[PDB]
Each structure stands twice: as structure tokens, then as C-alpha cells.
Amino acid sequence: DIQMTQSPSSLSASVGDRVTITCRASQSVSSAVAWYQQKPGKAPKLLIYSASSLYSGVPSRFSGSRSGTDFTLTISSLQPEDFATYYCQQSYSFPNTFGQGTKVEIKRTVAAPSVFIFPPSDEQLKSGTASVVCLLNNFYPREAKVQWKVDNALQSGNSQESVTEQDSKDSTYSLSSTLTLSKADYEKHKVYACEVTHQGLSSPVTKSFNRGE
Amino acid sequence: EVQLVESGGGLVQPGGSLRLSCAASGFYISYSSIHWVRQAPGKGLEWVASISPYSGSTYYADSVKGRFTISADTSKNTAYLQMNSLRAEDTAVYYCARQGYRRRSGRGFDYWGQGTLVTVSSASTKGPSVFPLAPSSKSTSGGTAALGCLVKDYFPEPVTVSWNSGALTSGVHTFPAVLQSSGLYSLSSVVTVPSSSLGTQTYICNVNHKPSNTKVDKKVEPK
RNA sequence: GGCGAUACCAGCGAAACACGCCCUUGGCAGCGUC
Ligand SMILES: [K+]
Ligand SMILES: [K+]
């Protein structure tokens, strides 16, 4: 098999920046190389074919070039709609092969999260489990520390996080952290708190509630 | 004009079998090469197989050779992927793609279907429990309130979540599902609204899990 | 630079292979040799 070694695996660039994505084929592929754009949740779209030819309808800020077995995709000036994962693909021989992809996200200024905490519903508690949810809304960058404290004790190994894809208009992210405990474990404590550290915050932000109260 | 529509995906056991179809509209497949390409959740594109015009010659990725067969029926304008001896690593969205016309776009794949989800797992189907995430503030607080629904313990993906039957979309975040230690998925869907709308406006989350034939509407009220 | 024997890329047909047409010319690149 011909390997397509694509780099970098991800990048965060500002609108107006020049973006360069590289793909090296492990042996000759002549010029039989195509580039695709895939937005989250969507099907891929063809951008460039035969290494350097612009596919009809594609904006001219996209171009491709070949130097030997090195293939480059350039966006001359990144536009807001250009966030996507980009893939190179060789069609020189079977089996055809794709590069691993380069995820392009939009860089923006730092934004601190708005934090919310949710106690478990009474309906869930009756089933014997308590989920406590912490929401970090509309922040940048993605990196954040969420720490759960139950009656001031740091928790570990009982929570999971999920993060949304970057918002198309505000380039921010949101995150949920869910702490799961048994009904008996939940009922042995009073104060439930979520402490958030993020570089948009001068110091950590805690949201809490007191059980029953 | 040009359309490709995949179908046939679903949930099957390891060792099982499935046949996907790709129905072409707006062009005749007999004059084109047709490819299958798959994508595991959150992973990259992986070329699977292809079939050539006129000859009918077929080609396969090493990872599926001997287990999968690509075919086409030009009289039905449809291509097929028979998948046998399936394993968990085959779980993916399966795309059908047209290789375009040589003089127009080289060997680029110029049209892609929307894909069909194939899940290979030993876990049984199970519909979600839906619990309210009660509004974070009082109706009289003057600011913004967050509220939502926790959609817990379901298998397989996907669920769909809407708010007020699709009338509420602004400010909605429905989070990617995460697998719990039990092997079941869970997610939350949240929305921010003006605190002053609490009471006046009713908030209902509509959850649909087609794989288990489960539909749940949950009202979310102030505690 | 010269010469020699080569090795691969390529035009068209809805077309990577197979099938049909066209072609005996172009093009990189190494080797051998002076
Ligand atoms: K074609
Ligand atoms: K075959």
C-alpha cells in the first residue's frame, strides 16, 4: 500500500492567515492526488484534483502543488467558512488511500466560560442514581479544568466530559462535565460543587448547591 | 441533479452480515467508477472498495479483502457492498462516492452520498431514560437561565434531540454522546433562555431513538 | 557535453484494469561508455 502521510494533524488559524497543509506519499503517485474538505456532520467535497487543478466551483483561494512526492494544499487567506477537516487522497494505484486528515479550526480571542450547575432530578434519584451536571458555556480556547468537590473533597474517577464542536458564528466551545454517584453516595453529602479553571478567568469559578436546601 | 443515496446500515453482531446499497440519480453508473469509503466516528476517511466501468473490475482495501464484495447492477443504476464476517472495527459511516469524468476532474471523487451508519457490537439495543436539567435561576433574576435534558443509558447511536418540536434552536447545545463504563451512551442537551421567559414559555425536549423505537417528550420546569 | 542500450510517465473513446481507436513522436530519470 502507498501511505499518504499528512501533516499537521490539526491547526488553529486566524481569518486572513495563509494555511499550508502537506501530504507526502510513500512512493511515486505521479500527480494522481486529490484534496477534500469535510465539515463536521457533512459529506466530503472535492477541492483539487490531479495535484494542482481546481475543481469547478471551488474558490480560488484554494490551490494545490506537487514537488516530487510532496503535495501541498494552500488556502491563501483563510475565510470564516473554511473550518473543516481536509484530506489528501492518492488514486495512482489500488488500493486507493487517504491521508489521516488535518482539522482546521478558527483562532479567536480568549473568552471565559459562563458556568452552570444542575442537581440530579428527583425522578432519577428514585431509580438509584444521581447525575450532577456542570456546564461551561461559550468559551475559548477549548482547554479547561473542571474539578468536582463534594463537601470540599476533590473527586476523581467518577466524572466524564464532553465538548461541542466550535461554533460557526462565535468560534467558541461548550463543555459538560457529569459526575455520577449512587443514590446512597449522593445522600451522604451536602455540598456539591464544580470549580472551573480557564485562562479567561483571573481565578477559578465555583458553582455549587446544597443538597435538599 | 447528481445524487447518491446509501441505505442498508444498522446494528449487527460481530461475525454478522449486511448488504449496503447506493442508489444513483441524475447520472448513469455504467459510465463511472463507483467507490465505497468509510469513516469511523471521529476518525478519518478510509477507502474500502471500488468497481470500474465497462470491465466491472473490482478492488479492495487490505482490511476488507475476502470479506466484502462490491458489485453494481447498471439496470438498477445501483451499487452494492456485501459485508460478511463483520467485526467491531468495521463500525463506521459508509459513503458511496462517484469518481468523476476523466477529462473534467481526473480521478477525483466529485459526488458523495450522505452515508449510512453501520454498527457492529455485541451490546443489545436499549432506549434512553430522559431526565430534566432544571433552570439554573429564578424567573425574576433578570438575566439568562440555562436548562436542559439528560439523555442517559442508550445503545446504539444515534439519538436526536429537539426543543419545543424544533421551534427552539437558538442557544441549544446538544453534546456528543460519551460511552459510560457500562458500555451505554449518555449525553445532555442544554439551552440558554431569558430568565423572564420561565413560566410564560413552556420548554419540552423531544428525544427520538429510532434503533429502540423509543420517543420521549420531557417538560422541563422550574424546581 | 558526445554516443549506446534501456527502464518508466503520456492522446482519445462517459474508460486507472480489460476492450476499441490513435501513435512511433514527445518527456523526465538513471545506467553503460568516451
Ligand atoms: K467516468
Ligand atoms: K469482487
Resolution (A): 1.8
A33 CA → C4 C1’, Å: 37
- Say which residues have a Cβ less than 8 Å from residue B133's Cβ, sequence separation at least 6: A118, A121, A133, B146, B147, B148, B149, B150, B188, B190, B220
Q: Nearest Cα to A133, choosing from B146, B30, B4?
A: B146
A101 chain-B contacts, CB cut-off 8 A:
44-45
Alpha-carbon distance of A177 to A147, in angstroms, equals: 9
Are the beta carbons of B106 and A1 separated by less than 8 Å? no
For residue B35, which residues of chain A lie inside 8 Å, CB to CB?
96
Nucleotide nearest to B55 (CA to C1'): C18
* C-alpha distance from A50 to closest chain B C-alpha (Å): 6
Strand order in the sheet with A153-154: A153-154, A145-150, A191-197, A205-210
Q: Give me the sheet containing A114-118, strands edge to edge.
A: A114-118, A129-139, A173-182, A159-163
A92 touches strand C (CB under 7 A): yes
- Method used to determine the 3D structure: X-ray
- Chain B residue numbers with beta carbons less than 8 Å from the beta carbon of A89 are 45, 47, 109
Cis previous bond, B176, omega within 30:
no
Residue A50 CB lies within 7 Å of the nucleic strand C:
no
Residue B80 CA to residue A128 CA, distance in Å, equals: 47
Second CATH level (architecture) for the domain B3-120: Sandwich (2.60)
Rounded to the nearest 5°, which phi and psi values hold at A125? -55, -40
Rg (CA), chain B: 22
For every residue of chain A, DSSP letters joined together read: ---EEEE-SEEEE-TT--EEEEEEESS--TT-EEEEEE-TTS--EEEEETTTEEPTT--TTEEEEEETTEEEEEESS--GGG-EEEEEEE-SSSSPEE---EEEEE----BPPEEEEEPPPHHHHHTTEEEEEEEEEEEBSS--EEEEEETTEEP-SSEEEEEPPPPTTT--EEEEEEEEEEHHHHTT--EEEEEEE-TTSSS-EEEEEES--
Letter for the amino acid at B102? R
From chain B, the residues in CB contact with A123 under 8 A are 131-132
Domains of chain A: 4-106 (2.60.40.10), 114-210 (2.60.40.10)
Q: Which three-class secondary structure state does DSSP give residue B92?
A: strand
Q: Is the CB of B60 under 7 A from strand C?
A: no
Return d(Cα A180, Cα A130) in angstroms, integer.
6
Q: Which nucleotide is nearest to A94 (CA to C1')?
A: C16
**Distance of A213 CA from C33 C1′ (whole Å):** 98
Contact B188 A50 (CB under 8 A): no
Specify the fold of B129-219.
Immunoglobulin-like (2.60.40)
Query: What is the C-alpha separation between A154 and A132, in angstroms, rounded?
Result: 15
State in Å: Cα B205 to ligand 2 middle.
47
Domain ranges of chain B: 3-120, 129-219
Nucleotides of C under 7 A from a protein CB: 9-10, 12-19
Distances (CA, A) of B203 to B61, B180, B195: 49, 28, 12
Centre a 10 Å sphere on the Cβ of residue A50 and count the other Cβ atoms it contains. 19
Q: Is the CB of B103 under 7 A from strand C?
A: yes
Distance in angstroms, CA of A27 to C1' of C31?
21
Could you tell me which of B39, B209, B17 has the C-alpha nearest to residue B113? Answer: B39
3-state secondary structure of B116: strand
CB contact under 8 A, A178 and B188: yes
Query: Side chain identity at B7, as an amino acid letter?
Result: S
How far A187 CA sits from the closest chain B CA (Å)? Answer: 19
Residues in CB range of B78: below 8 A, 6 or more apart: B21, B22, B23, B24, B29, B72
What 3-state DSSP class applies to B27? coil
Which of B47, B136, B180 has the CB atom closest to A96's CB atom?
Answer: B47
The one-letter code for the residue type at B9 is: G
Q: How far is the CA of B106 from the centre of ligand 1 (A)?
A: 9
- The side-by-side arrangement of strands in the sheet containing A19-25 is A4-7, A19-25, A70-75, A62-67
Paired sense of beta strands B68-73 and B58-60, if any? unpaired
